[PDB]
Amino acid sequence: DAPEKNYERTMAILQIESEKAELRLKELEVRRLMRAKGDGPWFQYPTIDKALIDHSPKATPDN
Amino acid sequence: PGIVELPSLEDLKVQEVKVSSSVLKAAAHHYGAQCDKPNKEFMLCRWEEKDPRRCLE
16 A cells, blocks of 8 residues: 555544543443433432322312 | 411301201201301311411401
8 A cells, every 4th residue: 555545544544533431431420411411311319200190189188 | 497377276266056967967058058158268268268367267
């Protein structure tokens, strides 16, 4: 191969691998913040659905 | 937390229906017919306010 080919192919490899490495570091930091705060789409453990609540007028008033 | 607010014992005085349960049950259907409107105002107030303190009058 030409040294141009190896050289620019190496630059392509280094761009792809450095972008993957920065995305992995961002993935670690995103997971840390979402586990700490719970305000992301991940780590959303379920609570009780409020579509189960009966809002009908019950038998006794004080409720 | 906060002080729970209770009405005075003068807010709770009213002349009582001092009759027995059979006396109430014997006139029950005529009581439901004739005393309909304040009873239904009270039970609407009771299921809406959800509080015996807002229903005293």
